[PDB]
Design a protein around this ligand. Sequence first.
Ligand SMILES: CSc1cnc(SCc2n[nH]c3cccc(OCc4ccccc4)c23)nc1O
Length: 130
Amino acid sequence: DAFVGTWKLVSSENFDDYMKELGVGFATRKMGGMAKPNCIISVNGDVITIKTESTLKNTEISFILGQEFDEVTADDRKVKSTITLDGGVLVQVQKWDGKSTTIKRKREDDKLVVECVMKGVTCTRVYERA
Ligand SMILES: CSc1cnc(SCc2n[nH]c3cccc(OCc4ccccc4)c23)nc1O
């Protein structure tokens, strides 16, 4: 849809602080901070697929809006995820151990803007079309 495409990371703010707030250890934060991922978003009927690709790590999720699914995150958390579309924004919540984090993906001008929140920490990652 508005989101379908191949997106390349072009800026990031506060991603280390966000990872730290999630309890990610140094080695994984180091590799994650240095990563320059592509994000490939596709849709087929009810099912949306989001691939995140980088030199040192690839991940993928596929989901139906509103239907909770199990996910293993890049930092190896075992979470329950739900994604919904609200006002043109894909809103993802991950829940694990009584905690939650939100990841909001929006389209703004030429950008795919991703806002990641854990407690008081807010990270913004910006992608542009490949
Ligand atoms: C949600 S938004 C988002 C998510 N992940 C990435 S790159 C992940 C990655 N690529 N290579 C990597 C190599 C090592 C570690 C990585 O991640 C760690 C991480 C990701 C997320 C939460 C906590 C820890 C990576 N870009 C984004 O924009």
